[PDB]
């Protein structure tokens, strides 16, 4: 049967609402009046009324902002009923895809990560790993594409930058010499995860590194 | 059957071309590849190729500017053929309505209208009528709504404005006294017709009035 292509609608649209999505029609409307209705999640089942249809014109409308991270896709069915009460079409499946906006900051899997490193560790030695996730669309956008950086180190001794981080993997490695358990046994790093390949929304967490013998 | 509402497209659209009108789909495309085609005047019969369809996506497109005054409406039919060669849908009728722009000046039915009036005619006496037409859309717009005015009178004696015109009907009447065949036997009026209720595109013609005894 001839049907409508999937409709795309972005999340977080600003008003006014409602907004038109598509106008549908039954050509049985040349035989008399036809009334249009829609069913399905987002229509007549929870969340009810997010989408509505104009009963005489066939204009399908969205009534409020969408959220791809709550519902990314809707399946509705349109119905066409004669003024005399009989269904004049088999219901038509209508697909609505919510497209992404960058509206979730990355979030570290926990607030504090801990690690240890031996004081004689060669420069280049992997120490620990920090990890963040991003609830945005990683298939179609860079809105969930996380880069990792170090914002600070405490103490800043013997050097300000004892460590470096892999911007893609969140692996923290020793980058210089002079670790000394008997002097500075613990380093606290503030680390950042930022989406859009480092350029977007961001969050921070802490990496606490113990220097061992 | 579920079908597409009539599509509106304005005449005289600027490019680039082609431009999308509607995307169609057969849900038989879940059984295998479906190829889309369109027939009808403006598609595969004269004027050929004004509308085209993308064979795999189903995007129906217009390829050049339209002219409501040459063709105001098109009836096309879409077809859906399997990759194996069989028609998988009954063809669907698609209606395209060209909407108007004000792109025709009014035109007087002839360049010179003639008339006569008796020298003793009472002020208010109807003399003659001038008529213009406008090829634009008089049903849906003011693009064919003509107002008539007088631009000049020769001679300007005994008064500059011996006559007036009815702005809606183009009827010219005597508005003052002093007509005199033995002095000024002939008046030449330049008259104007302008659409958008007098405010739009315009043309002129001449009304030549003979004063009789
Ligand atoms: Ca969201
Ligand atoms: Ca999002
Ligand atoms: Ca994000
Ligand atoms: Ca030591
Ligand atoms: Ca030691
Ligand atoms: Ca035209
Ligand atoms: Ca026109
Ligand atoms: Ca006009
Ligand atoms: Ca006289
Ligand atoms: Ca006389």
From Swiss-Prot, chains A, B:
**Is Iron-sulfur included in the keywords of this UniProt record?**
no
Q: What is the effect of changing residue 90 to G?
A: In DGLBC; likely benign
Which residues does the annotation say bind Ca(2+) 1? 103
Cadherin domain ranges (all copies): 1-108, 109-213
Q: Provide the tissue specificity.
A: Expressed in granuloma macrophages (at protein level). Expressed in the skin (at protein level). Expressed in the liver.
Q: Name one GO cellular component term.
A: cytoplasm
Residues noted as binding Ca(2+) 2 in the record, renumbered to the chain: 103
A single MF term (Gene Ontology)? cadherin binding
Kindly state the subunit structure of this protein. Homodimer; disulfide-linked. Component of an E-cadherin/ catenin adhesion complex composed of at least E-cadherin/CDH1, beta-catenin/CTNNB1 or gamma-catenin/JUP, and potentially alpha-catenin/CTNNA1; the complex is located to adherens junctions. Found in a complex composed of CDH1, RAP1A and PKP3; PKP3 acts as a scaffold protein within the complex, the complex is required for CDH1 localization to mature desmosome cell junctions. Interacts with the TRPV4 and CTNNB1 complex. Interacts with CTNND1.
Any miscellaneous information on file? May play a role in blister formation in Pemphigus vulgaris patients, expression is lost at sites of cell-cell contact between the basal and suprabasal layers in blisters and immediately adjacent to blisters.
Q: What note about domains is in the entry?
A: Three calcium ions are usually bound at the interface of each cadherin domain and strengthen the connections, imparting a strong curvature to the full-length ectodomain.
Implicated in which disease?
Diffuse gastric and lobular breast cancer syndrome: A cancer predisposition syndrome with increased susceptibility to diffuse gastric cancer. Diffuse gastric cancer is a malignant disease characterized by poorly differentiated infiltrating lesions resulting in thickening of the stomach. Malignant tumors start in the stomach, can spread to the esophagus or the small intestine, and can extend through the stomach wall to nearby lymph nodes and organs. It also can metastasize to other parts of the body.
Q: What does this protein do?
A: Cadherins are calcium-dependent cell adhesion proteins. They preferentially interact with themselves in a homophilic manner in connecting cells; cadherins may thus contribute to the sorting of heterogeneous cell types. CDH1 is involved in mechanisms regulating cell-cell adhesions, mobility and proliferation of epithelial cells. Promotes organization of radial actin fiber structure and cellular response to contractile forces, via its interaction with AMOTL2 which facilitates anchoring of radial actin fibers to CDH1 junction complexes at the cell membrane.
What protein name does the entry list?
Cadherin-1
To which species is this protein native? Homo sapiens (Human)
Lineage start: Eukaryota, Metazoa, Chordata, Craniata, Vertebrata
What is the gene name?
CDH1
Q: Please state which portion of the whole protein this structure contains, as first and last residue out of the total length.
A: 155 to 367 of 882
